[PDB]
Amino acid sequence: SGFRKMAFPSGKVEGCMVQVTCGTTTLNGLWLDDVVYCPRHVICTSEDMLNPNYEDLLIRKSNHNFLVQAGNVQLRVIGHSMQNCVLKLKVDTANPKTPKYKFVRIQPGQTFSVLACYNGSPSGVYQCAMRPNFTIKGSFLNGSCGSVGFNIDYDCVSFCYMHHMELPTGVHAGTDLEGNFYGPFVDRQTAQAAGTDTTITVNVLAWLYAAVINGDRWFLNRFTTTLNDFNLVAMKYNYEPLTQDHVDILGPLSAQTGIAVLDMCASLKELLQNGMNGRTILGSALLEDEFTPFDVVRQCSGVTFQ
Amino acid sequence: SGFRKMAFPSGKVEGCMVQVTCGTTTLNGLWLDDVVYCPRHVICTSEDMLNPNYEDLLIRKSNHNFLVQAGNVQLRVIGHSMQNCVLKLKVDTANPKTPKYKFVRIQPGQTFSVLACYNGSPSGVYQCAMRPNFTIKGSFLNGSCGSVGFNIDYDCVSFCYMHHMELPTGVHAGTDLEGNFYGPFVDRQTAQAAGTDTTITVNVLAWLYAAVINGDRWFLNRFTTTLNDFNLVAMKYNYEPLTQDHVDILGPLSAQTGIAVLDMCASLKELLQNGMNGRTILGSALLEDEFTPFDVVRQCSGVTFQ
Ligand SMILES: *C[C@H]1CCc2ccccc2C1=O
Ligand SMILES: *C[C@H]1CCc2ccccc2C1=O
Ligand SMILES: [Cl-]
C-alpha cells in the first residue's frame, strides 16, 4: 500500500544523454541510433533569443561547429538538419545503449517522467503532466534544455517531450521529439503568457480511486450525480469537462473498488464545494491531478518493465 | 525555477537488481561485486512469518536452494550467510555493472530515492524520508521486498535502505544494507505499532527557503523569534525540536536568500498557528518535510552525478 508520485526508471534514458555545445551555449542532446536530437536554440546567443532567424543563424554553422560528447569521449558529427524546433545531428557512431523507442506526441492530461540533465549528465528524475494549457510544471535551471520526458511500456521508451523554454511565470514549455512545440509557444524570449491552468478532472477521479484502494475513504459520501450536473460544478472550479470517454477509461478502477464513476463524481463535487476541512487524502491537502488512470493501476498492481 | 520531488537517476541501481527465489517466495536482491543481498525472510513461508526462527529455517537451506536470476540468465550461488536480517549470497560472477558504492546507515530526517522492483525488474522510482519514528512512507506491494533506497553523490551510490515489511497501518519498515532494522521493528508478522510521526522541522524550513527562491513569498512576515520560543510552538504541533546544529545547516540557504534562519522560523510559527488560509506553497497546501537542506541546494543549483 501507499501511493507516491512515481517516475519510470531512468537508466534506459541516461544512456542516451549527451552534451551538445555550439560556440556559445551547452545544453543536452538525445543520442538514439546515429542521430543526436537537441533544441535548435543551441545555435543562439542569449542575445539572439530575443528575435532569432534560425535558418539564417544556421547558415553559418557546419558539422564541426557542433561539439557532441557522450561522457568524456567526443562524437563525430557527419551531418546536421533542422526539423521544426529541433536539430538532428547525424553522428558516425550508433549509440550502443539505444533502447527500443518511439516518438509520441502526447495529449494534455497525460503524464510522463522527466530526466533533468545538465552538461549531458543526469541530475534527477521526477513526474510531470502536460497541462491543459500545454505547459508543464517542471524543475529546470539554465542548461537543462534538451532534457526529455518519456514513458516506458515493456521494453520500449516512448519519448514525448524535449525541454526548451522557461516562461516568465516559472512554468515550462517544449516540443515533441519531432520539434513541434506543445501549445502555442515559440523558442523566442518574448511575451507569451500561459492560459488558464485547468484541473485534469479524470486524473483527480483516478487519484480518488487510488485513495480508496490505499485506505483513505472519508470523502466517500452518500450522493451520486450526472455528467451534466457534475460538469456545471466542474466549470465553476475551472475543471476539465468530464466526458463519457473519461468515464469509460475509469471503468477498471470503478470495478476494482466497487464505486460507480458517477458516485465518485458526487464525492469530488462535495470536495470542491466544501473543501477538505483540514483533512488530507493520500498525504495531500489538495486534489491531485497529475496521476492518470493508467498511472493508478500501474502503481497499485506493480507492473514491470524489462 | 520550479520545485519538484526529485529522485536520483536510477540507472546505476537498476543494473544491480536481481530476482531471488527460495522454494516459496520470490523477492528482489542487490547484486554488488560477487555478493547478492536480500531480506532473510525470503526463506519463509507466509505461514512462517508469524513467528520464524530464521537460524533453524536456514539449516534446511543450501546454496542451490537460492535461485538468483539477473534478467534471464541464472547466477551460480557458491556460498550463503545470514548477517542480522539480510542474507548475503556469494555468487561466482562479479556484477559487471557494479557502481562505486558505499553502505550508509542514515539518520531520521534524511531523504533517499527508492527504486521499487518486482521479480528483480524495476517498476518506478520515488523520493522518501526516514521518518523520526523510523518508518518510511513508501509505495510497496507484495514482492517489492528487497527494493533498496539510495543516494548518489558524484560517481558513488550510497545504499541506505532495503525494504522488508509493511505494517498494518500501511507504512513501511526496513534495514540498512548490513541488515539492521531502522527503529524497533522486526521481520515478523506481529503487533508492532509506529510511534508519533513527528514533522522534520529543519526540512520544512529548507522547503520554505526553496519557496522563496522559486517565487513564493507570501508567507514571509515581519516577525522574528528565538530557538526556545519557536520550539514551544514546535512541540505543540509535534514538530522536531530545532537545534543550533539545524540552524547552522541552514546557513547556506539563509545566505542565498538573505532571510535569517530565525526570521524564517517566525514565518513557520505563524503558518502553524494560523494555517495557510487556502493558499499554497510550491504547489502544496501543507508544509512539506521530506526535502533536506542539501536536497534544496542540489535542486536549485543543478548538481551533476557522473
Ligand atoms: C532551457 C533553459 C533555458 C534557460 C533557463 C534559465 C533559467 C531557468 C530555466 C532555464 C531553462 O529551462
Ligand atoms: C515486502 C512486502 C511483503 C508483503 C507485502 C504485502 C502487501 C503490501 C506490501 C508488502 C511488502 O512490502
Ligand atoms: Cl511528489
Side-chain angles (χ1 to χ4, degrees):
Chain A
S1 77
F3 211 69
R4 280 268 187 199
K5 201 97 126 64
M6 188 168 72
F8 292 92
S10 78
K12 272 142 183 256
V13 181
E14 294 174 47
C16 303
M17 300 307 322
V18 301
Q19 181 192 239
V20 180
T21 301
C22 197
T24 167
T25 326
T26 289
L27 40 62
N28 307 282
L30 182 70
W31 181 18
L32 302 168
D33 298 322
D34 64 337
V35 181
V36 173
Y37 307 79
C38 70
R40 69 171 177 175
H41 71 54
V42 71
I43 71 183
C44 288
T45 78
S46 189
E47 184 265 335
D48 286 331
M49 291 309 297
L50 306 173
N51 178 66
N53 189 304
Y54 287 99
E55 290 82 15
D56 290 334
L57 279 170
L58 201 53
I59 298 204
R60 294 207 60 263
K61 295 298 182 195
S62 302
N63 290 335
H64 69 268
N65 287 126
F66 296 93
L67 308 187
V68 189
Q69 210 177 288
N72 32 68
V73 300
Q74 231 64 43
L75 292 180
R76 193 174 291 277
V77 177
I78 53 154
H80 70 272
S81 65
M82 189 173 54
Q83 162 178 48
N84 303 299
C85 291
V86 295
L87 292 182
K88 302 206 280 172
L89 304 175
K90 191 176 192 298
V91 287
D92 75 338
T93 304
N95 185 3
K97 315 166 180 198
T98 296
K100 166 63 195 137
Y101 72 89
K102 303 171 136 74
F103 292 168
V104 170
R105 186 171 177 84
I106 55 149
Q107 303 264 332
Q110 286 305 293
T111 59
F112 56 88
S113 305
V114 169
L115 176 67
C117 298
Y118 298 91
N119 300 121
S121 288
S123 157
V125 69
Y126 53 80
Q127 197 77 349
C128 288
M130 176 68 43
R131 303 307 306 176
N133 66 4
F134 292 102
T135 74
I136 75 171
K137 292 183 162 135
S139 182
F140 292 110
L141 304 175
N142 185 85
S144 71
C145 334
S147 301
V148 299
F150 61 100
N151 284 283
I152 303 181
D153 285 18
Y154 290 70
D155 48 346
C156 180
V157 182
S158 281
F159 293 104
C160 59
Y161 181 83
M162 178 165 280
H163 181 58
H164 280 251
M165 314 282 283
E166 183 177 77
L167 314 178
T169 45
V171 308
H172 302 114
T175 73
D176 59 28
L177 268 294
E178 287 166 19
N180 295 307
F181 262 90
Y182 287 101
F185 306 113
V186 289
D187 44 3
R188 194 183 347 287
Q189 202 198 133
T190 193
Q192 35 192 337
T196 305
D197 193 23
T198 63
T199 308
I200 305 149
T201 307
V202 70
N203 293 0
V204 175
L205 292 167
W207 168 82
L208 287 172
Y209 276 107
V212 174
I213 294 170
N214 292 289
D216 292 357
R217 346 186 151 229
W218 62 260
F219 52 87
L220 295 175
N221 65 7
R222 317 165 150 292
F223 290 67
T224 193
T225 186
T226 72
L227 262 198
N228 282 346
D229 276 42
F230 173 84
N231 278 334
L232 293 187
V233 183
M235 188 152 291
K236 183 224 280 202
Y237 293 95
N238 291 319
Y239 266 57
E240 276 186 3
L242 199 67
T243 68
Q244 192 52 229
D245 281 1
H246 296 146
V247 180
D248 297 344
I249 292 145
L250 289 160
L253 279 172
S254 181
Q256 211 184 132
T257 63
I259 289 148
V261 169
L262 285 183
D263 291 3
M264 191 65 79
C265 288
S267 289
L268 181 51
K269 176 207 226 164
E270 297 305 314
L271 286 170
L272 295 172
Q273 301 186 110
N274 296 309
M276 312 189 43
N277 293 119
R279 311 160 274 197
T280 58
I281 298 175
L282 289 182
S284 178
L286 46 77
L287 307 169
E288 303 285 338
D289 80 332
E290 301 206 335
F291 293 104
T292 68
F294 200 76
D295 293 345
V296 174
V297 171
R298 177 192 130 220
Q299 189 178 146
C300 293
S301 97
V303 161
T304 279
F305 316 106
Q306 52 93 32
Chain B
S1 77
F3 211 69
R4 280 268 187 199
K5 201 97 126 64
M6 188 168 72
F8 292 92
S10 78
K12 272 142 183 256
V13 181
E14 294 174 47
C16 303
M17 300 307 322
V18 301
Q19 181 192 239
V20 180
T21 301
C22 197
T24 167
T25 326
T26 289
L27 40 62
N28 307 282
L30 182 70
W31 181 18
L32 302 168
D33 298 322
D34 64 337
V35 181
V36 173
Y37 307 79
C38 70
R40 69 171 177 175
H41 71 54
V42 71
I43 71 183
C44 288
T45 78
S46 189
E47 184 265 335
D48 286 331
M49 291 309 297
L50 306 173
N51 178 66
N53 189 304
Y54 287 99
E55 290 82 15
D56 290 334
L57 279 170
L58 201 53
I59 298 204
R60 294 207 60 263
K61 295 298 182 195
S62 302
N63 290 335
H64 69 268
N65 287 126
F66 296 93
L67 308 187
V68 189
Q69 210 177 288
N72 32 68
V73 300
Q74 231 64 43
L75 292 180
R76 193 174 291 277
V77 177
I78 53 154
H80 70 272
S81 65
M82 189 173 54
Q83 162 178 48
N84 303 299
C85 291
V86 295
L87 292 182
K88 302 206 280 172
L89 304 175
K90 191 176 192 298
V91 287
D92 75 338
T93 304
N95 185 3
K97 315 166 180 198
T98 296
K100 166 63 195 137
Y101 72 89
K102 303 171 136 74
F103 292 168
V104 170
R105 186 171 177 84
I106 55 149
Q107 303 264 332
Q110 286 305 293
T111 59
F112 56 88
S113 305
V114 169
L115 176 67
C117 298
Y118 298 91
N119 300 121
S121 288
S123 157
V125 69
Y126 53 80
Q127 197 77 349
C128 288
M130 176 68 43
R131 303 307 306 176
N133 66 4
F134 292 102
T135 74
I136 75 171
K137 292 183 162 135
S139 182
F140 292 110
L141 304 175
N142 185 85
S144 71
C145 334
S147 301
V148 299
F150 61 100
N151 284 283
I152 303 181
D153 285 18
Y154 290 70
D155 48 346
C156 180
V157 182
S158 281
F159 293 104
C160 59
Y161 181 83
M162 178 165 280
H163 181 58
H164 280 251
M165 314 282 283
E166 183 177 77
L167 314 178
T169 45
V171 308
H172 302 114
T175 73
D176 59 28
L177 268 294
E178 287 166 19
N180 295 307
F181 262 90
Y182 287 101
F185 306 113
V186 289
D187 44 3
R188 194 183 347 287
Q189 202 198 133
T190 193
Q192 35 192 337
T196 305
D197 193 23
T198 63
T199 308
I200 305 149
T201 307
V202 70
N203 293 0
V204 175
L205 292 167
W207 168 82
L208 287 172
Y209 276 107
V212 174
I213 294 170
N214 292 289
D216 292 357
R217 346 186 151 229
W218 62 260
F219 52 87
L220 295 175
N221 65 7
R222 317 165 150 292
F223 290 67
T224 193
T225 186
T226 72
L227 262 198
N228 282 346
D229 276 42
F230 173 84
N231 278 334
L232 293 187
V233 183
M235 188 152 291
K236 183 224 280 202
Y237 293 95
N238 291 319
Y239 266 57
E240 276 186 3
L242 199 67
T243 68
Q244 192 52 229
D245 281 1
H246 296 146
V247 180
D248 297 344
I249 292 145
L250 289 160
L253 279 172
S254 181
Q256 211 184 132
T257 63
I259 289 148
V261 169
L262 285 183
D263 291 3
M264 191 65 79
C265 288
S267 289
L268 181 51
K269 176 207 226 164
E270 297 305 314
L271 286 170
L272 295 172
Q273 301 186 110
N274 296 309
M276 312 189 43
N277 293 119
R279 311 160 274 197
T280 58
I281 298 175
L282 289 182
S284 178
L286 46 77
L287 307 169
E288 303 285 338
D289 80 332
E290 301 206 335
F291 293 104
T292 68
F294 200 76
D295 293 345
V296 174
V297 171
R298 177 192 130 220
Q299 189 178 146
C300 293
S301 97
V303 161
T304 279
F305 316 106
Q306 52 93 32

